[PDB]
Amino acid sequence: SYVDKIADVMREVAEKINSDLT
Amino acid sequence: GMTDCEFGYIYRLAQDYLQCVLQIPQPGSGPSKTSRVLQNVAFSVQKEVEKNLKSCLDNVNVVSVDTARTLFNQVMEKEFEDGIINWGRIVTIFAFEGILIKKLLRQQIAPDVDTYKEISYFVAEFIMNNTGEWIRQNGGWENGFVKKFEPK
């Protein structure tokens, strides 16, 4: 689904945010 | 505090962020320190998500609040389907409502002055009911999010 493509980018950026804190 | 996971506080956060995106800060001394910290982090995320989804989002015409709500709900369900909650994911919720309000600004068929309040509302609904317990257990906004994301 096209929703999956959006959610995938959201998941990826979210974990970059968590890791980028350090 | 522990009660900042209740609806009213989260709604204010969601509304504050959309008012920042739309460049209509409301009069007063300004938003809370939570909102002030959230606005830079969420906007940085928003610009990156907009970049990484330019083609995908250009193929979606967000012509109404109902379209925005249904899309928001579907994206949120997929994003959180693995059961994982963390501050990065919560920040992306705010970034996504900023994306939606920008697309509504260009494509909404019947604009209403309270559109951003309607978007903020169902955003706060989702945050509270789907992440509120995790937020509370991790210090809430003041003792969790701000402590981790504020300048050192």
**8 A C-beta contact, residue B95 and residue B49:** yes
Q: Classify residue B36 by burial, with Cβ atoms within 10 Å: 0-12, 13-18, 19+.
A: middle
CA-based torsion, B68, B36, B49, B132: positive or negative: negative
Q: For chain B, how many residues are written? A: 152
Resolution limit, Å: 1.6
* Best of B62, B70, B75 to mutate (most A CBs within 10 Å, chain A): B75
Domains in chain B, CATH or no CATH each: 1-152 (1.10.437.10)
**8 A C-beta contact, residue B112 and residue B4:** no
CB atoms B88 and A3 under 8 Å: no
What gap in Å lies between CA A10 and CA B130, rounded to an integer? 16
Q: Please list the alpha-helical segments (H only) found in chain A.
A: 2-20
Other CB atoms within a 10 A radius of the CB of residue B146 amount to 18
C-alpha B97: how far from its chain's center?
Answer: 5
Other CB atoms within a 10 A radius of the CB of residue B121 amount to 16
Other CB atoms within a 10 A radius of the CB of residue A9 amount to 21
Experimental method: X-ray
Query: How big is the A-B interface in CB pairs under 8 Å?
Result: 58
What gap in Å lies between CA B45 and CA B92, rounded to an integer? 7
